[PDB]
Structures are given as structure tokens and as C-alpha cells.
Amino acid sequence: DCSPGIWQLDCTHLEGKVILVAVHVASGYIEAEVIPAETGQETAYFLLKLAGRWPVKTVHTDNGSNFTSTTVKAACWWAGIKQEFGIPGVIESMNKELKKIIGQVRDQAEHLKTAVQMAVFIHNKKRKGYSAGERIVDIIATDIQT
């Protein structure tokens, strides 16, 4: 999607832990956190953080049941977020890409969470020809003036 307020949120499992990954659909920019286990409360907390940093309008997921909890609904209500009911998705390979980079760097760090943030850094800085990190700020900045 071209729309700059659209994010996708999904969890992946690795080493008995959970990685919550948010992808800015228009740019391919990622933010991630390692959490103990998938819970509504953790998703809610993550969304509050994301919304305070970026202009989040709509969120999508590959697992709709992710957003059924009261806590998630509360966070979306307060921050003014809707569920995205478009996207009938390059975000699959985006997540597998991340899991690849994590694999490449994993032995360099003790903790998974360290490897994850290393992988997010690599992903967001990598040039394509701008990086995801540059594309997100450009898209959002532009949209402010539009």
C-alpha cells in the first residue's frame, strides 16, 4: 500500500520466545520486540509505543484473533487506530528476511533480543536506492505537507 498510516503486526516464534514485528507497509521499515509469550496485553503495550512514535492510522495482521482482546481494543481506541480492512502482501518475505538476518547474526550475541535488534538495524539501514529507514521518514514527512 501507498498509504503512510498502514502498519502490519505479527508475532514469530524463535527459541521458545516471541518476536513481535511491526512493518510499515509503504516503506518496509521494521520495529520489533522480544516478548515472553503472545498476549493481548503485550500487543496492546507495543501498539501504544508504536502510535506515540509514528502516525499510525490502521493496523493489519495475518492472524486476526491477535486483536480480539479488550486490552488491544483499548489501546487502539485511545490512540485512534482502526483495523485495516484493505490488503486482500510482500510482508511475508519481509518477516522471513528478518528471520534470515537474525540467523546470520545470532551466534554473535548471547541473547536473542540482541540479535533481533541487530537484525532490525541491518534491515532498516540496507540500501535498495534508499533504505527502509530513509523511506519511512520521507513518506511521513511528505504526507505532513500534503
Place this chain on the structure above:
Amino acid sequence: DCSPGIWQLDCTHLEGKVILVAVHVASGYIEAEVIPAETGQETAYFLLKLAGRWPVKTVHTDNGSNFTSTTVKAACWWAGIKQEFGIPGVIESMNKELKKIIGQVRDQAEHLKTAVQMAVFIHNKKRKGYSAGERIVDIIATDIQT
């Protein structure tokens, strides 16, 4: 400072917990996390996250001993961050402002960390006449083209 790669990191204490606050000096934009206690490892981890998201060149603090740990030095080395040896600071009132907003919203949430992220959201979205959230993306976007 006008320089867009400059951040200030400090911890504040509230309810027996620690709030790590990063301020983008040029814009006044904030990111924050609640941690159990001040440790080098938590500061290091926080820096890795910050660096993966923004083009962080130099970091300053009001407590220099914050950055003596091996873990912090490792994170700064890997992410290519230097200590800022300028700034001989509106960032004091910036932190007290945040603690004020937290006070205003605190009773609305069970957890301190929820109130903190609520306060970060409010701070970053508030118009001055742009918000901190808009100023950071503008400053960074502009600097990409310069």
C-alpha cells in the same frame, strides 16, 4: 543543537522503577521505556533499538557514568555512535514536562509503563506550529537530501 544526529539519554526514578528517556535534541521528540533498574545492559539494549530506528550519531547524558559499562561501549561501537562532546540544555524541562504529563495521566492506568507511553504519545503529538513527532521526521528527511 541544530544537528539531527544528536540524542540525549537519561533515567528518571518513579514508583521504585526506572524510566529511560531519549530526547532528539533538535526536535524535542521523545522515546521512553520503563526498566527494572539502571544497568549498563539495559542502556546498551535501549541504544541498539534507538539506533536501528533513527540515524543516531552522537549521544549525550546528564550523568556521564551512565556510559562507562562495556555493554554500552559495545553497543555504541557496533551501531557507530560517539559520545557528544558539545552541549556545554532545554532537555531538563523536557524531562520534567514528561514527568508532569505522566502525573496527569497516571491514575488512568494500572501500570506506570502504560502511563509513560501515554505521556510520550501526548508529548510527541502536541502542536507548538508543528509537533515533535512531525519535526523529527522533517529534520531527518531534510538531512537525507542535504
